[PDB]
């Protein structure tokens, strides 16, 4: 949320994108298409797997401890045994609550970040050949067939090839 893309300027997610977490939809002379972006997808996944690696399968061994249930009333010593355990449980419960709240805030933010980073990268790549429509979409001011769209998605788009055409279309009356 803090970057402003996911649940922000991107109006909604795409239920029909099932082969990645982030990607591109386009419309050009040859149709309307969708493609996943693998690098951004893997960047988010790697970070979340990093959190999982620090939480899952990491337990501590304990053996003989103190008693925690009692059949008889005893007074002072038992009051202390119970208080030590209640103290411990409340501290661990607090740690667990905070851990999940913080980690979840951070996951939502880092995933929003990866969306924003992909958007920014694409904006820069297009140079003077496109304009940002405000909703995560670019209007590209030149003929941009499937190979051209592919070149943008693959980082091989040469903006100089199309710049004269695009400037003429952008700055007409």
């Amino acid at each position: 949320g803090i970057f402003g893309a996911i649940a922000g300027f991107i109006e909604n997610g795409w239920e029909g994108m099932v082969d990645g977490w982030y990607g591109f939809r386009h419309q050009n002379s040859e149709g309307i298409g969708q493609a996943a972006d693998l690098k951004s997808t893997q960047a988010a996944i790697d970070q979340i797997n990093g959190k999982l690696n620090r939480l899952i399968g990491k337990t501590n061994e304990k053996f003989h401890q103190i008693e925690k249930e009692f059949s008889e009333v005893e007074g002072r010593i038992q009051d202390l045994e119970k208080y030590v355990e209640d103290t411990k449980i409340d501290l661990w419960s607090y740690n667990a609550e905070l851990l999940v709240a913080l980690e979840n805030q951070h996951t939502i933010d880092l995933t929003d970040s990866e969306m924003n980073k992909l958007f920014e990268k694409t904006k820069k790549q297009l140079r003077e050949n496109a304009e940002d429509m405000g909703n995560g979409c670019f209007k590209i001011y030149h003929k941009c067939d499937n190979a051209c769209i592919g070149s943008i998605r693959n980082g091989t788009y040469d903006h100089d090839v199309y710049r004269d055409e695009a400037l003429n279309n952008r700055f007409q009356i």
Binding site: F24, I56, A96, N104, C137, C148
Partner: protein, 317 residues
Amino acid sequence: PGATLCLGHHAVPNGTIVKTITNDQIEVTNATELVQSSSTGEICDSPHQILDGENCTLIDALLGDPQCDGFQNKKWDLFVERSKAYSNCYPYDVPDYASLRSLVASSGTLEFNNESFNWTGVTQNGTSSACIRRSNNSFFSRLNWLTHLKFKYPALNVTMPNNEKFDKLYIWGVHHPGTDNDQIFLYAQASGRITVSTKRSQQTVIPNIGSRPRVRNIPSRISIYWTIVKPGDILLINSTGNLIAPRGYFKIRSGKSSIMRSDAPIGKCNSECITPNGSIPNDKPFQNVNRITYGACPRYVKQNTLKLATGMRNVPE
């Protein structure tokens, strides 16, 4: 005409609600549970060495109640005490019971070594109808009830050195008869104190004659004591009656052993984490099954669910 290129992200039709710093309910695409809240209900017999107490408490297995003879010299990682367990020998109490139970549980062995105590002048091997072993009157297997020999009980002053390289745990007791008649019948004299000592310790106990409410028809009692004897130290037992003598010592070890109260069945299965409700998986960092645990276990918390987001905010079409 030109083209349009739109950047976007996935969504799912079945998102899950998580908590964050700023919102107690936000939908993400996926999450995972961090609190283990279930058990199958069995204590797995692997990989920890489990000893099912069955009808025996640990202390009854220690002293040698006749239903506990199968426990002799056994070891455990976890001794499991059942709520149905009951005693069926001479009625006894243990001042500090919890501490004796704890130190034996933690030692993890009932390894016992007989020793040749010099009990010259008394009758050994006293038995009772309150402690039946194969229809015969009997007594605790690890204790030696000494009584008069030909209406004489001379002063005992009996020594046992520890020339081993480990510590020895001695268990012994004092008999409190129900009446003055019983005192005379058993020990041939008025009661007097028992003193058990070493170079570093001394315990003296006074037999107290009198009726207690009958337990399995017995108004007398035995009180149980223990003494640890270090290498190069010496046990000394000084009595003129009422002594329930040791037959030898228990080895005392250190390690990972403990004891748990549970009525869960033991299963043929493999699980690292044991609770009184049964073994639990230990993939998750937390659990709300039981504060009582043994082994590699998640940490007990009060929450029954804690969902960790594993995907982005879910923003459906």
